[PDB]
Amino acid sequence: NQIDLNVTCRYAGVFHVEKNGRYSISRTEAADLCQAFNSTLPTMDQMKLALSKGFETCRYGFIEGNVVIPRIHPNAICAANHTGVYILVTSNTSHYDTYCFNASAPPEEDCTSVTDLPNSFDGPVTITIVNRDGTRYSKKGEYRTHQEDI
Numbered sequence: 337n338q339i340d341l342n343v344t345c346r347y348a349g350v351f352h353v354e355k356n357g358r359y360s361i362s363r364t365e366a367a368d369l370c371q372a373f374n375s376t377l378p379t380m381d382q383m384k385l386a387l388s389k390g391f392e393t394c395r396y397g398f399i400e401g402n403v404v405i406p407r408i409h410p411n412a413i414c415a416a417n418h419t420g421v422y423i424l425v426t427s428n429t430s431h432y433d434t435y436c437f438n439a440s441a442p443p444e445e446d447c448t449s450v451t452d453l454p455n456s457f458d459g460p461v462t463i464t465i466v467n468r469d470g471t472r473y474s475k476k477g478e479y480r481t482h483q484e485d486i
């Protein structure tokens with residue numbers, strides 16, 4: 337009973353989380369996951385500011401209201417070569433990564449490691465935060481509040 341949460345640097349408080357390194361988060365789970373980081377799903381405005389500070393990924397993830405990919409550099413295999421906050425229009429499926437927004441983060445780029453999942457609740461899952469530099473923090477707990485996500 338183990339979950340890896342791979343987390344990025346924060347940019348104006350916005351970061352990306354993937355569960356087990358593959359698209360596997362529903363919209364309800366995404367909200368719960370951000371809540372566990374004392375964070376919320378970003379607004380479009382929040383994501384645009386993060387982009388302006390250097391944030392880009394090659395992953396679809398939830399924000400409030402849409403699924404998006406922030407792009408700075410055009411790449412043919414990431415958001416069909418678009419730049420800016422690319423909005424997913426047409427998809428059959430419901431599971432993506434998520435973005436999260438932590439208002440208490442620094443205003444620009446913060447690439448220090450994440451060492452806590454401060455708002456996880458009691459539970460039986462070994463949850464491991466994995467930073468890009470390999471630094472890990474584990475705890476026993478849970479964050480999913482919807483049964484359909486478990």
Ligand SMILES: COCCN1CCc2cccc(N)c2C1
Binds near residue numbers: 458459460
């Ligand atoms: C209100 O949350 C109830 C569900 N949680 C409550 C806390 C908890 C602790 C250890 C194992 C499990 N399964 C659980 C389940």
Ligand SMILES: COCCN1CCc2cccc(N)c2C1
Binds near residue numbers: 345394
């Ligand atoms: C946005 O990056 C998607 C690719 N994955 C690749 C695997 C991985 C491992 C640990 C932390 C992070 N951020 C990542 C990122």
